Structure formats: C-alpha cells, structure tokens
Amino acid sequence: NDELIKLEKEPGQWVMQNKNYANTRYSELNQINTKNVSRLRLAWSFSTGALRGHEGGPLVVGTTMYVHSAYPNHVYALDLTQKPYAIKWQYTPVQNSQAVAVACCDVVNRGLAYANGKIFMTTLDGQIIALDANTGKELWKMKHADVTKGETITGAPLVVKDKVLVGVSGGEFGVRGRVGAYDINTGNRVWLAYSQGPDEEVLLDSDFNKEFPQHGGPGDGTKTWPGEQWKLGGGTTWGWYSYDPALDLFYYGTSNPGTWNAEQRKGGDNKWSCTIFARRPDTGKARWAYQMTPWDSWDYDGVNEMILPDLTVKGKKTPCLVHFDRNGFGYVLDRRTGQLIEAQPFVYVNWAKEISKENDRPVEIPEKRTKQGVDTKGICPNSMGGKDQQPAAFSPQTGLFYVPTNNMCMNYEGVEATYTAGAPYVGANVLMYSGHEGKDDYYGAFICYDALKGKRVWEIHEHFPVWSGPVVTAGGLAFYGTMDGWFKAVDIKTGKVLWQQKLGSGIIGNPITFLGPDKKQYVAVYSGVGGWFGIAVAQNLPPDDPYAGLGAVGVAYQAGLPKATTVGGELYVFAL
Amino acid sequence: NDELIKLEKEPGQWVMQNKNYANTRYSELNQINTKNVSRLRLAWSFSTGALRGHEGGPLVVGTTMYVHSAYPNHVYALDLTQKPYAIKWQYTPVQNSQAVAVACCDVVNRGLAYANGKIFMTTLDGQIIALDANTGKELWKMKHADVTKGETITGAPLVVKDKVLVGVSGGEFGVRGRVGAYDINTGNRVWLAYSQGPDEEVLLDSDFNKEFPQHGGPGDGTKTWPGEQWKLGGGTTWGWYSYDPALDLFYYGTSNPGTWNAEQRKGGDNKWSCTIFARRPDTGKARWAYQMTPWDSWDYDGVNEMILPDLTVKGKKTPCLVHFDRNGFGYVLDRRTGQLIEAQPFVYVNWAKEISKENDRPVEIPEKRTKQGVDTKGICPNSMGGKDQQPAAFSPQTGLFYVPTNNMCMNYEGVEATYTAGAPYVGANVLMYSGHEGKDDYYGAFICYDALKGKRVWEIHEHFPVWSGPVVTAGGLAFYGTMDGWFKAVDIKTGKVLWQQKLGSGIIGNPITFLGPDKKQYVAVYSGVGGWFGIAVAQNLPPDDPYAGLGAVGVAYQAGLPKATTVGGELYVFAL
C-alpha cells in the first residue's frame, strides 16, 4: 500500500502491528536511550474495558492512537493532542458469543490495521470490519469465518495495495486454514487461498517452487494426506503477515495439520501445514512454499512472523526471510525463492538432531515422535514451541535478533480423534513442564540471537515464558513485558536490565514506541494476562487436572502463574 | 476494638476505610508535601480482576495491603516486602448471581475491615465473611441479607470491640433497613437494630433522646407512618460507620423511607428514615437519633459519613459529629446528645430555606416538594445529593473539611408504586441535569468548608461530579480522583492543583496514604468508573431513555461521561 510504504518510514509513527511490512519491530527513535532510560515513568494509562489476554499493540497514525481489546473486541481512537488524550471514538461489534466456546487459546486479538483513512479489525466470531478512521463509523463488514464450524479469528489483518488480508483460527477444531483478500473500499472478496486441498483451492502460480521442486509442488495439498484427511487439515493462518513490495510477495506461516493424533495423518507430509508461504497479493497465487515440519506430531504451528531483513550471507547482501519457529529452529531463507540458507536451534531441541542441508528436512529423533496410545516423554520444545506468537525484533544497527522464548518440555500421547463440526478435533493428552526435560527452574528467556551463526549472543532467564514481542530502538534498548507484570528495558549490547516497573497484570502485549504531537518519545504496552500459557488465569481453571488447556493448566500452576498475576486490560504509556 | 484503637494512631497504617474510628481520613504523614508533590510518580499497580465501580480503598495493616474489587468481590492480600509486592493470598466468595439484578446503583463494594488477625468482607449477595488475614482461609460466613427480598450489601463493615457491624441496601426495593452485629470469632449474630417498626426492633435505650424529646421517641418507628407502610420503610444502612470509644457510641445514617412516592407515606415523619443514629455497640440500643429529612420526597438518603472531630464551639472544646448530607446541608451535632449546633448548605439548596432553629426541622419551600402524578421541576440538589457516599475528610491542623460534591438538579414526579418482593419499589420518574436549574456547565466541585461558620472557604469546579473521598495529610495536601480518570493533589490552603495524572478509568475510589516496609510514603487509589452517576458506563445503558438508572443515564450522557471514560479495575500506587 503506497501510503503505508511512506508512513512506515516515518520514525514517530507505528502504523502496523510489527512497525513495518518487513516486521522488524525496530524504531529509529533515540530520545530514550541507555544513558537516560532509568528516568522513564508512567505518563498516562487507558483501560481497554475488557479482561483476559491483551495481545498485539496499539497503532499510532498521525496524532491518533488506535487501541483494541480482548473479546468482545472494543476498538478506540485516542486523540493524542488532548493532553494527554481524549477518546475520539469507540466501536464494539455485535458478535455471536458462541465464539468464546470455540477459542482454543484465550479470547485474544492481535490487533488493528490502518490504510487510506480506514481502520480494519477482526472479531473472534469471524468478521472482518472496516471503520472510518476519523469517525469510527462502520463502512463495511464481511463474515470471513464460521463459529459453528469451530472457526474464530484472532490474528491481525494486513493491508497490501487495495486489499486487506485476513486469516482464520481453528487448527484444534479441524478447520481448513486459508487467507482471504478483501477490497479495502467495498469489502468484496477477491481471492481465497487454502493451505491444503486441490491446487484449485491452494492457488499455485505457474512458477511455484520452480527453483526448489524438492520443497513440493502441484498435488501435494491432497496427495501428502491419507484418504481425504486434508478436509480437516488445519494449516490455519492466525500469525503475523509480512510483505516485500519490491518482489510483490507477501509471506505467512500455517498451523498444525489438524488432529494432534499423527497416526490419523500417517503416510505423508500433510502439506501445506507447518509451512512458510510466499504469495502474490493481486491473485493469492503461491510463488514458493517451504514446509518446516512435515507430518507434525507436536503441534508445532508454523505461524510465527516472517521478518524480512537484508543480511550478509557468505559476504553477499541477500534479501532474507527469518523465522523463529515453534519447532525450535531459527530459519533463514532467501525470500525470492524459498532457498534454505540456515536453520539452527534457538532453544534446546531434542525432537530433531538438525535440519539437513542435504534435503532441507528435519533429521528426526524417532523416540521423540509421538504416537497413538503410547506416551512420548520429554519432548523439547513443548507444543507452545521455542516461541509462540509473540514476535521477535531485528536491529539493522547490530544485525541481530531479539527474541522472546519459552523454556519448556512435555509428555504427549496421541489418542484417536473423532470429528464433530463445532467441537474440538484434537486427539492428544499433553503434560507440560520446565525445560531440559523438567530439570530447569525457569520457563522462559529473552535472548539476543545471531541467525546465520545460530548463536545465542546473550540470554536473560525469565521465570515465566516471555509472551511479549519486543520493540528495539536506535537508543540501544529493547522493551518487553513478563507474565507476572514486569515491563523491562534492556541494554541490547550487554543484556542488562536498565529499567523496570511492575504493572497490574501479566503482559502479553507487544510494546511500541512513537512520537506524540508534542514531539516527545513515548513507549506504550498492553497489560492483561492470558493467551495459551495464561489460560488457567484468564479462564479461572483449577489445578485438579494438569492435562487441561492441552497441558497449559498443569505447567502454569507448576510455574506459579496463578499466584503471580490477576486478569486485567490496561494500556500503559511511558515517557522520560 | 483495643487493637484498632492502637493501630489507627500509627501514621504508616490505614487499618479501616476512613483511617480511624472518627472517619477523619487524615494522615499525619508529611514525607509528601506541597513542596515536593510535583515529583510524585507511579511506583506500581495491581489489577483487581473486575470491571465496573471500584469504591472504597485498600487497607494497609503491618506490611500487608488488602485489596477488594467490585462484584464478584475478589479479595487480595499483597505482601509489600516483596519489591514492590507479591500476591500473598486471594479469595473470591461463591455468590448468588441474582444479586446483580437487585443492585440499584452498580455492583460496588465499599471495602474490607480488619481486626484481631482477620479480614471481614461483605458480598453483594448479602454475606458477611471472616478470613484469616495471614492465609486467606475462610473462618466463618453468615447470611445477613436476602437477595430474594431485593436486599444487597455494598457497605463496608466496621469492627467495634468483639463485634463486626454490617448494614444492608435496598431502599429502592422496600427493604427494612437495619444494622446487625456479629461476633468476630464465631460469626454468631448478637443483635439487629432496625430503622423503623416497633421499639423492640428499633432498639431504644432507656435514655433515648432524653435531652431532645423534640427529636422523637418511643413508638415513632410506627406512629409516624400511615398504616403499616413502615414494613416497606427503607432506612437502609449502606454508608460509613463511626465510633467514639470514650462515649461507647457508634454512629451511622439511614436511607430514604422506601417508596419514592411520598403520597403513599403521607401523614407523618416516616421515622427513622433519613436519620443520624447513635447506638451502644454492646446491645445495639439507641442513645439518640436525629431525623434530617422528615417525610422525604427527594430520595435524600441520610447515609453519608458521621465524622467525629473535637471542635471549638463558642470557645469550648466540644465532641462533635459532622455530616454532609445528601439533602445539601452540612450538619454539626453534639455527638453526646444529638444537639444541633449548626446546619447550613454546603451546596446550592432550593428545596428548603433553612433548618429551623426552633424545632430542627427543614423549613420547606412548598413548590419543591414532590407529588404523585405531577412533575416538580428544578429541585437542587438532585437525588444524588449535595454529595453522595464519597466521604469527606477533616484536618485537625486547619479545623476545616475537604468535601467532594455534586452540582446537579432534577425534575421529579411521584408515581403510584406497587410492592412485589424482589422487584423495585420506587414510584418516581426523575430527570437529572446540571446545577442551578440546568444553568451550569459543570456537574461537580471539590470544596474546603468551614462547618461551624457554615461557609465555603474555596471551591474547585469540576466537570463531573466528584465521586472520590479525599485523603488529607499533614503535608498540606488533599488527594482525590475525578470521573474521567484524573488523580489530583491540591493545596489544602488554596485549592491549587499541585500535581495530577490521567489514569485508565474514572476514579470512584477513596485514596489512602501509608508507609511501606521501606519506610517510604505511598499514595494509593482505585480506578474503575461506576457507582450511580457512572451506571450508564458500568452497565452499558443507551442514551435513548434518560429516565433510566433513576435519572442517572440522562445526566451522565449530558455531562459526556460515556465519551470520557471506559470501565476498568486497577489499583495505582504512587511515591516520590
């Protein structure tokens, strides 16, 4: 989108969830820096009017901040000229409350998009809605997903050219994952690209994987599944999307292949679950695709963000795609072709020895592959992954990544799953615990990572999983939150915490930084615990059954999360 | 209670809602003062895990802070030694959700009491519960009120000697108001003192009103009503209680006489609605009582706090009771006998000329007394009163009062009311608007008031009603919050605002100040809009029917409250 290509370069603005189309989450602002961040204090706050998990972050476009909440998905515009703000408008959509019953992993929403004087929001119950950015009035809406089939929407949409791109959730409900594109003016659907099924539904371009046919091709959307299991094939699309206008490609990842009982998917790769897609925004046709986890047996969703840095590879500047997958590997691909440049573990991994550079497939450790009716013990990372949706940041100054991570493992037993539309389609008993097969006393880490070397440059061990995606700045700082409510500023060179404050609820928001109309730098973040690891707190679940929340209940109580935080929903804005 | 008599004098503590048994809301702490308050910043915050109105404030006893929420009445103990706090324990009672439907004025709760290693809480659905202060273990619980009769509890209990004193709400539901006393160790009910009915239920001591028989006597609980209308007589007891151990008297006020249609109560004073009671805590027997508003026709509940200062009256140190009533008069009584020393308006009053010095009765302006089936226009104050429950503060240094006030008026039409147990028993159509018969552009004020002279010293006009009870300190400061979220410190000598910060939701909490284990002074307040004036926001009521919420909906929309604030529930703690 032409306006967005201009706006994303403006240091004071934050016009899409991960700052820019490359998803770097990096700001050139340096008013706040390593020498003065100890003077950071709360400037103002704003209640979202909802409880449970507050993911994503606000947008700042012009002099207006746009704020979004957990279900029922309140949206607000704040006029930042009004000292410190006034509520310019608010909007709450009408929704089918049955959506709450079919959300796997809390009633979260990863936030708004902005383009051409319009705000775009998704709703848990499956709507894409366009609002006038200045008045908050509804311009159009479309039903993109159906809760009666176990579908929800939690992901943030992306505007590319004159289209808004919208995914779906339900990989635990047998949903057919897909991305739909809607005209931003009319709301008319232009295309719909599925993650499995016939080529007619997947949408492949004539040059699909031309350079790397070993990565897959025509027919694989059905032929890599037994019988017609692809009909319940998952590959949902609830993570972060990126875009390279110079290549005319947008990128995203796809979820687990539906049922968690891999026995019922046996015989093939189950493409295109657990896959990185590169697609043409005009037509939705795929130019390339790389499947990270063939025949998944761990719930290693592929949906984490696709950061688009230009890195020096073998002494050559290369347009890359960098992705820290749930499966524990940090992938570096050539974003033109899907060539695998590097893949190394960014957390402790024991389900695979490595990703082979001979065939770009995991070299599996057979004893860690799950099966039906037999428990598999001590798999790392667990299903919540090396990291979950919480997005990493990239500094073009240092050339390094700043990555929120999990340090957890699990036992996982497949069981036969039966499909009933609108009900869970899982088929696993999962018990989760701390890292290195229950040897560690901490459950998260914030790291600095060199993607091409596969090296953790430094690490901050965190008691809880780090479920907050950092913002990194030219001031030499990374900001992130913890699940017991600490908001922290770290020196990116040293890994030292320079400033921190305890907020009212666990932080699963991704902080932003922006300039107000006063030309002053602010840092803003949502507080309000929830998401998958926080589900015991968000949904008030007892400790009696540790298998509940598909393993999340047991591990949260072991980590002490219910003793560490309450639910909330608050936007906090800091300044010097 | 002897422990509390000692604890209330310790500057670093805040062991009952209004600081001490005299309800002065005054702290001797002077670390924070007029010279340095500009350096006040947020230290930490804590989400209460609830939305809607957050009234009262936290307690600080030893190194533990006790926090309470709106329905469903979450209670927390925060260990303040844990840098800055850890959650020591939490408790949430099981409640009958039917309580929500019979709450007149939002699902608020005015807070906890502490005594003898126990925390005492009330619940909306009518329970009084004792918890172990160190572990949160439930020790006993008793049913005090019955939601099936339209009774709820919103008031904070008071511990006196070995008894916890508990009131009831339901003056809009034909409830018989009363105070009950429960043994703090066993929970056994000791006595129950009604606000109307026969003497055996009202509980009169042999010296009741001995010095002032003109204030009423034996039999008036039935004789001052037509027929048996006292059986639906209101006089509920949802405000703040005070205690003088030297006199062995506790004090409180009583609500409106039930139906808002005065025609159905015609013929007498309707005692003891709208009354100040002084009772013996051992037996519940009344030593004196003074009815402020005989045969009420405005819903001027008498429940506002009974502050117990020692004032110099004609050169003589005198034990007084000072009360800023809903009816707009600031009363000063001798707290030994109920003698009226002074009564003058603290807001604009047009329903009465004065309180008669001959017989201590309002000299009414007949055109402003309401009637059945005909509107009465331009009554000031309106039913929300000169001030509502939000408690005033007293400084023993200045001898003056610091009072949050409303600036509003109304039209009020009586309507025939029919009683159905559990359903509303109102009988009025009320429209509310700004002060001075709709001429003013502001709806509130924070004032300094000289009670004996009967004069305002200074006033801060506030756009919204001030629904937050100030804390006043030896540092020369008053702290209070506004309904659009501003927390403010003002110079008590002049009313100048010295410091302010915009919080996430309108403030209807009463701030406190205390010393942490670090020996630093903190100021704490709840944010989370609601209560009667905030009901349009808390209950999400539309503007199309301005009569809704007993008139509160129309006036909130006209003042712009729904455009100024969202719902929330957060504790904010500030320090230098």
Ligand SMILES: O=C(O)c1cc(C(=O)O)c2c(n1)C(=O)C(=O)c1cc(C(=O)O)[nH]c1-2
């Ligand atoms: O397969 C799916 O459709 C799907 C959807 C979502 C979601 O929509 O939040 C999550 C997951 N899977 C998932 O596997 C997961 O670990 C997860 C964590 C969270 C969260 O917000 O904390 N959502 C989701």
Ligand SMILES: O=C(O)c1cc(C(=O)O)c2c(n1)C(=O)C(=O)c1cc(C(=O)O)[nH]c1-2
């Ligand atoms: O008559 C009653 O029993 C009763 C109860 C309550 C309550 O329980 O909060 C209020 C009132 N009356 C009332 O008249 C009133 O103006 C009021 C304001 C509020 C509030 O918390 O903002 N409660 C109440």
Ligand SMILES: [Eu+2]
């Ligand atoms: Eu999944």
Ligand SMILES: [Eu+2]
């Ligand atoms: Eu009342």
